[PDB]
Every structure is written in structure tokens, then in C-alpha cells.
Amino acid sequence: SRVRAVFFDLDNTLIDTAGASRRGMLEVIKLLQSKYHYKEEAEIICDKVQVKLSKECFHPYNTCITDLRTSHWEEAIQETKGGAANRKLAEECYFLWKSTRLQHMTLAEDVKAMLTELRKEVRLLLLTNGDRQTQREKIEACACQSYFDAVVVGGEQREEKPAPSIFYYCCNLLGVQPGDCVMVGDTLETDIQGGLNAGLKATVWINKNGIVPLKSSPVPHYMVSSVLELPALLQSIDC
Ligand code: VO4
Ligand SMILES: [Mg+2]
């Protein structure tokens, strides 16, 4: 009845993806406004891209995603500004956005110290959705793979969260039973729903911003604001 494995989301759970991604946007705005003499049109372009990205995370992706997310910019520039297509400016914007966010994707020192002290009591797995190319780059950017007994990327797999199969696979990977695992993540629709679907021992929601969820949304077993609260939490579930 003791916890034998803990699964961890990556984005906005272990690394500040959102903060990093907006930092990239800020640089793109800084670029367009200063260099290419833009005003408030730049901020509109970034919003269009941001919503374009959301309507593309559909699974199972195809590659090259680079060509896709780059096209997301040229489609965005033309809508706000206008004129002929500018693949060069789109290429610049994307890689500036990409290079910026990846450098800000790092594991905090106290987060590293938490993961290190935790894997000597339970096994650790990294369970993240997204395409192979994009996610693996993040993994390398924050060098987290060294901290986990296993890493599983949804794009590389048959199904992602919240589908229970990918959870069952993680369990087989570590030779454990779903009832011995706890899922930790910050998205209800994937991390939490998935944990409930796959009958895991517990689900832990990361809610630092203090969202009050709808009654119809998945209900976690636990709710905390930081991943630093797990050791005490996991010790209370008895491990
Ligand atoms: O690391 V994720 O929040 O895209 O499952
Ligand atoms: Mg997340």
C-alpha cells in the first residue's frame, strides 16, 4: 500500500514553460517594434500565434513541426500587417521565440534537490504530452532526464494523457501497478483526468495561481501550489 512510483508532468510543473514562452514573445515584440518599426501591431501578431499554437496541439503530430510553427508566424504577420508572405521574418520570429524559451527552461535548484532526495525512496517517471521534437528539446534544455528512472513523451507513444494506456505503459516500464503510483501535474484535463482514468493511487494538482475549478471538471485527490510540497504529501499517503 506504499507508493512505489511517482509520475511527473514537465511543463508548468517542473519548469516554468509559460514564463519562458512569454519571455520569447517579449523578445519578438522587442524585435518587431524596434528593428522593423512596429507599434502595437506586434502584440497582436504574438496573440494570433499563441492561439494558433493551441489549435495545433491535437496529436499525434507529424513533423516537421518547425515548418508548421514557422508557418504559424507568416500566417500571423500577414493577418495583422499585410502584404506578401514573409518567410524570412517568420523564420526570424520563430527561432528568436524558440531560442529564448529554451534557455529559460531550467530546473530550479531546490526542485533538483527535491527530485534527488525523492528517487531514493520511490521511483520517478517523467510523463509529458507533446510532439517528440519539441518535448525532447525541452528535456535537454533543462537536463532533467538524469533525475528520472524513466522519461515518456506522448508524441512518441500511441496515445497521450488522459488516455489510460500511456499510464499503463509507464507502470509496465517500472514494473509497478497503477495502484502504487501517484500522478503530479498542473492540468486537470490531462494529468488529473489521466490519473483517475488509470486508477492510480493518488492525483496531485499543481495550482499555484489559485484557480477555482468548475464542478464538472476532474477532481484531484490533493491540491498544492508547488511541486516542493510533494515529499511531505507523499509521506502522508504513507511511503
Ligand atoms: O509536461 V506536460 O504539462 O505538456 O504533460
Ligand atoms: Mg503542465
PDB file of N, CA and C in Angstrom, residues 11-63:
ATOM      1  N   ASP A  11       5.947  20.489 -18.247  1.00  0.00           N
ATOM      2  CA  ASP A  11       5.599  21.896 -18.467  1.00  0.00           C
ATOM      3  C   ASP A  11       4.716  22.497 -17.374  1.00  0.00           C
ATOM      4  N   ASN A  12       5.187  23.594 -16.790  1.00  0.00           N
ATOM      5  CA  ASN A  12       4.471  24.319 -15.735  1.00  0.00           C
ATOM      6  C   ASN A  12       4.273  23.489 -14.476  1.00  0.00           C
ATOM      7  N   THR A  13       5.018  22.393 -14.383  1.00  0.00           N
ATOM      8  CA  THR A  13       5.038  21.554 -13.193  1.00  0.00           C
ATOM      9  C   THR A  13       6.451  21.512 -12.635  1.00  0.00           C
ATOM     10  N   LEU A  14       7.409  21.216 -13.507  1.00  0.00           N
ATOM     11  CA  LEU A  14       8.812  21.168 -13.115  1.00  0.00           C
ATOM     12  C   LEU A  14       9.589  22.345 -13.693  1.00  0.00           C
ATOM     13  N   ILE A  15       9.148  22.831 -14.850  1.00  0.00           N
ATOM     14  CA  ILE A  15       9.753  24.013 -15.453  1.00  0.00           C
ATOM     15  C   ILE A  15       8.707  25.074 -15.785  1.00  0.00           C
ATOM     16  N   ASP A  16       9.105  26.336 -15.687  1.00  0.00           N
ATOM     17  CA  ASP A  16       8.211  27.438 -15.998  1.00  0.00           C
ATOM     18  C   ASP A  16       8.107  27.669 -17.503  1.00  0.00           C
ATOM     19  N   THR A  17       7.400  26.777 -18.188  1.00  0.00           N
ATOM     20  CA  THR A  17       7.234  26.890 -19.635  1.00  0.00           C
ATOM     21  C   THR A  17       6.517  28.181 -20.031  1.00  0.00           C
ATOM     22  N   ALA A  18       5.441  28.505 -19.321  1.00  0.00           N
ATOM     23  CA  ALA A  18       4.644  29.696 -19.614  1.00  0.00           C
ATOM     24  C   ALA A  18       5.455  30.989 -19.495  1.00  0.00           C
ATOM     25  N   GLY A  19       6.203  31.119 -18.406  1.00  0.00           N
ATOM     26  CA  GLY A  19       7.070  32.266 -18.221  1.00  0.00           C
ATOM     27  C   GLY A  19       8.130  32.342 -19.304  1.00  0.00           C
ATOM     28  N   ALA A  20       8.686  31.191 -19.663  1.00  0.00           N
ATOM     29  CA  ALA A  20       9.713  31.145 -20.684  1.00  0.00           C
ATOM     30  C   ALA A  20       9.136  31.496 -22.049  1.00  0.00           C
ATOM     31  N   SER A  21       7.963  30.955 -22.354  1.00  0.00           N
ATOM     32  CA  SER A  21       7.334  31.200 -23.646  1.00  0.00           C
ATOM     33  C   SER A  21       6.958  32.670 -23.829  1.00  0.00           C
ATOM     34  N   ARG A  22       6.502  33.321 -22.766  1.00  0.00           N
ATOM     35  CA  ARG A  22       6.166  34.738 -22.882  1.00  0.00           C
ATOM     36  C   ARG A  22       7.419  35.604 -23.001  1.00  0.00           C
ATOM     37  N   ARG A  23       8.501  35.175 -22.361  1.00  0.00           N
ATOM     38  CA  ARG A  23       9.779  35.864 -22.495  1.00  0.00           C
ATOM     39  C   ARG A  23      10.220  35.897 -23.954  1.00  0.00           C
ATOM     40  N   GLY A  24       9.979  34.800 -24.665  1.00  0.00           N
ATOM     41  CA  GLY A  24      10.251  34.737 -26.088  1.00  0.00           C
ATOM     42  C   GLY A  24       9.382  35.705 -26.867  1.00  0.00           C
ATOM     43  N   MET A  25       8.098  35.743 -26.526  1.00  0.00           N
ATOM     44  CA  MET A  25       7.170  36.670 -27.162  1.00  0.00           C
ATOM     45  C   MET A  25       7.624  38.115 -26.953  1.00  0.00           C
ATOM     46  N   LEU A  26       7.991  38.450 -25.716  1.00  0.00           N
ATOM     47  CA  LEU A  26       8.525  39.774 -25.402  1.00  0.00           C
ATOM     48  C   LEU A  26       9.727  40.153 -26.271  1.00  0.00           C
ATOM     49  N   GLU A  27      10.585  39.185 -26.572  1.00  0.00           N
ATOM     50  CA  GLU A  27      11.729  39.458 -27.427  1.00  0.00           C
ATOM     51  C   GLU A  27      11.296  39.683 -28.868  1.00  0.00           C
ATOM     52  N   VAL A  28      10.272  38.955 -29.303  1.00  0.00           N
ATOM     53  CA  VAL A  28       9.749  39.122 -30.656  1.00  0.00           C
ATOM     54  C   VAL A  28       9.119  40.499 -30.809  1.00  0.00           C
ATOM     55  N   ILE A  29       8.390  40.922 -29.785  1.00  0.00           N
ATOM     56  CA  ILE A  29       7.793  42.249 -29.783  1.00  0.00           C
ATOM     57  C   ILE A  29       8.889  43.308 -29.796  1.00  0.00           C
ATOM     58  N   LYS A  30       9.899  43.110 -28.957  1.00  0.00           N
ATOM     59  CA  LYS A  30      11.061  43.991 -28.921  1.00  0.00           C
ATOM     60  C   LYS A  30      11.741  44.060 -30.287  1.00  0.00           C
ATOM     61  N   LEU A  31      11.780  42.932 -30.989  1.00  0.00           N
ATOM     62  CA  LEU A  31      12.395  42.874 -32.310  1.00  0.00           C
ATOM     63  C   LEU A  31      11.580  43.650 -33.335  1.00  0.00           C
ATOM     64  N   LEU A  32      10.309  43.284 -33.466  1.00  0.00           N
ATOM     65  CA  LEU A  32       9.423  43.874 -34.463  1.00  0.00           C
ATOM     66  C   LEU A  32       9.268  45.383 -34.293  1.00  0.00           C
ATOM     67  N   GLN A  33       9.030  45.819 -33.061  1.00  0.00           N
ATOM     68  CA  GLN A  33       8.850  47.237 -32.776  1.00  0.00           C
ATOM     69  C   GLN A  33      10.108  48.062 -33.042  1.00  0.00           C
ATOM     70  N   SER A  34      11.232  47.630 -32.485  1.00  0.00           N
ATOM     71  CA  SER A  34      12.477  48.381 -32.600  1.00  0.00           C
ATOM     72  C   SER A  34      13.081  48.294 -33.999  1.00  0.00           C
ATOM     73  N   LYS A  35      13.350  47.074 -34.451  1.00  0.00           N
ATOM     74  CA  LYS A  35      14.015  46.863 -35.730  1.00  0.00           C
ATOM     75  C   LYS A  35      13.117  47.171 -36.924  1.00  0.00           C
ATOM     76  N   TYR A  36      11.961  46.520 -36.979  1.00  0.00           N
ATOM     77  CA  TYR A  36      11.077  46.641 -38.137  1.00  0.00           C
ATOM     78  C   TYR A  36      10.045  47.764 -38.004  1.00  0.00           C
ATOM     79  N   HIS A  37      10.230  48.619 -37.003  1.00  0.00           N
ATOM     80  CA  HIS A  37       9.406  49.815 -36.819  1.00  0.00           C
ATOM     81  C   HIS A  37       7.914  49.504 -36.682  1.00  0.00           C
ATOM     82  N   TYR A  38       7.576  48.676 -35.699  1.00  0.00           N
ATOM     83  CA  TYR A  38       6.186  48.328 -35.431  1.00  0.00           C
ATOM     84  C   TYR A  38       5.692  49.079 -34.203  1.00  0.00           C
ATOM     85  N   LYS A  39       4.374  49.173 -34.060  1.00  0.00           N
ATOM     86  CA  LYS A  39       3.782  49.855 -32.917  1.00  0.00           C
ATOM     87  C   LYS A  39       3.111  48.858 -31.977  1.00  0.00           C
ATOM     88  N   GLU A  40       1.789  48.767 -32.056  1.00  0.00           N
ATOM     89  CA  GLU A  40       1.043  47.838 -31.215  1.00  0.00           C
ATOM     90  C   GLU A  40       0.565  46.641 -32.025  1.00  0.00           C
ATOM     91  N   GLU A  41       0.968  46.598 -33.293  1.00  0.00           N
ATOM     92  CA  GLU A  41       0.612  45.501 -34.184  1.00  0.00           C
ATOM     93  C   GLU A  41       1.341  44.227 -33.781  1.00  0.00           C
ATOM     94  N   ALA A  42       2.550  44.393 -33.251  1.00  0.00           N
ATOM     95  CA  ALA A  42       3.380  43.264 -32.853  1.00  0.00           C
ATOM     96  C   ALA A  42       2.698  42.418 -31.787  1.00  0.00           C
ATOM     97  N   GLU A  43       2.147  43.078 -30.772  1.00  0.00           N
ATOM     98  CA  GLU A  43       1.474  42.374 -29.687  1.00  0.00           C
ATOM     99  C   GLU A  43       0.286  41.566 -30.208  1.00  0.00           C
ATOM    100  N   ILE A  44      -0.348  42.055 -31.271  1.00  0.00           N
ATOM    101  CA  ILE A  44      -1.459  41.335 -31.887  1.00  0.00           C
ATOM    102  C   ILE A  44      -0.967  40.067 -32.584  1.00  0.00           C
ATOM    103  N   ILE A  45       0.153  40.189 -33.290  1.00  0.00           N
ATOM    104  CA  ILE A  45       0.753  39.067 -34.003  1.00  0.00           C
ATOM    105  C   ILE A  45       1.082  37.908 -33.068  1.00  0.00           C
ATOM    106  N   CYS A  46       1.658  38.231 -31.916  1.00  0.00           N
ATOM    107  CA  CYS A  46       2.032  37.214 -30.943  1.00  0.00           C
ATOM    108  C   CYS A  46       0.816  36.505 -30.361  1.00  0.00           C
ATOM    109  N   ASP A  47      -0.265  37.250 -30.150  1.00  0.00           N
ATOM    110  CA  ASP A  47      -1.502  36.654 -29.662  1.00  0.00           C
ATOM    111  C   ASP A  47      -2.078  35.679 -30.684  1.00  0.00           C
ATOM    112  N   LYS A  48      -2.032  36.061 -31.957  1.00  0.00           N
ATOM    113  CA  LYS A  48      -2.516  35.195 -33.025  1.00  0.00           C
ATOM    114  C   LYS A  48      -1.730  33.891 -33.061  1.00  0.00           C
ATOM    115  N   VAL A  49      -0.412  33.994 -32.921  1.00  0.00           N
ATOM    116  CA  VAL A  49       0.443  32.815 -32.871  1.00  0.00           C
ATOM    117  C   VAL A  49       0.084  31.963 -31.663  1.00  0.00           C
ATOM    118  N   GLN A  50      -0.107  32.623 -30.526  1.00  0.00           N
ATOM    119  CA  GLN A  50      -0.401  31.930 -29.280  1.00  0.00           C
ATOM    120  C   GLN A  50      -1.671  31.097 -29.385  1.00  0.00           C
ATOM    121  N   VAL A  51      -2.684  31.634 -30.057  1.00  0.00           N
ATOM    122  CA  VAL A  51      -3.931  30.902 -30.221  1.00  0.00           C
ATOM    123  C   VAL A  51      -3.794  29.864 -31.333  1.00  0.00           C
ATOM    124  N   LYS A  52      -2.909  30.133 -32.290  1.00  0.00           N
ATOM    125  CA  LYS A  52      -2.627  29.172 -33.352  1.00  0.00           C
ATOM    126  C   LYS A  52      -1.976  27.921 -32.779  1.00  0.00           C
ATOM    127  N   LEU A  53      -1.059  28.116 -31.835  1.00  0.00           N
ATOM    128  CA  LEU A  53      -0.369  27.004 -31.185  1.00  0.00           C
ATOM    129  C   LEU A  53      -1.337  26.102 -30.422  1.00  0.00           C
ATOM    130  N   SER A  54      -2.345  26.713 -29.806  1.00  0.00           N
ATOM    131  CA  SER A  54      -3.329  25.989 -29.011  1.00  0.00           C
ATOM    132  C   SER A  54      -4.218  25.106 -29.876  1.00  0.00           C
ATOM    133  N   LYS A  55      -4.482  25.555 -31.100  1.00  0.00           N
ATOM    134  CA  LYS A  55      -5.350  24.826 -32.019  1.00  0.00           C
ATOM    135  C   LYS A  55      -4.562  23.828 -32.874  1.00  0.00           C
ATOM    136  N   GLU A  56      -3.301  23.599 -32.514  1.00  0.00           N
ATOM    137  CA  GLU A  56      -2.448  22.667 -33.252  1.00  0.00           C
ATOM    138  C   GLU A  56      -2.038  21.458 -32.408  1.00  0.00           C
ATOM    139  N   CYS A  57      -2.040  21.622 -31.088  1.00  0.00           N
ATOM    140  CA  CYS A  57      -1.760  20.516 -30.174  1.00  0.00           C
ATOM    141  C   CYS A  57      -2.899  19.504 -30.196  1.00  0.00           C
ATOM    142  N   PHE A  58      -2.998  18.743 -31.284  1.00  0.00           N
ATOM    143  CA  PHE A  58      -4.138  17.852 -31.481  1.00  0.00           C
ATOM    144  C   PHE A  58      -3.784  16.369 -31.371  1.00  0.00           C
ATOM    145  N   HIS A  59      -2.494  16.049 -31.520  1.00  0.00           N
ATOM    146  CA  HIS A  59      -1.996  14.662 -31.533  1.00  0.00           C
ATOM    147  C   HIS A  59      -2.502  13.883 -32.759  1.00  0.00           C
ATOM    148  N   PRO A  60      -1.644  13.040 -33.363  1.00  0.00           N
ATOM    149  CA  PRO A  60      -0.283  12.651 -32.975  1.00  0.00           C
ATOM    150  C   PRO A  60       0.849  13.429 -33.644  1.00  0.00           C
ATOM    151  N   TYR A  61       0.560  14.608 -34.196  1.00  0.00           N
ATOM    152  CA  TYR A  61       1.569  15.434 -34.875  1.00  0.00           C
ATOM    153  C   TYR A  61       2.214  14.683 -36.050  1.00  0.00           C
ATOM    154  N   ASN A  62       3.137  15.322 -36.766  1.00  0.00           N
ATOM    155  CA  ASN A  62       3.697  14.673 -37.953  1.00  0.00           C
ATOM    156  C   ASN A  62       5.148  14.984 -38.311  1.00  0.00           C
ATOM    157  N   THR A  63       5.592  16.203 -38.013  1.00  0.00           N
ATOM    158  CA  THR A  63       6.935  16.669 -38.376  1.00  0.00           C
ATOM    159  C   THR A  63       7.111  16.810 -39.898  1.00  0.00           C
TER     160      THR A  63
END
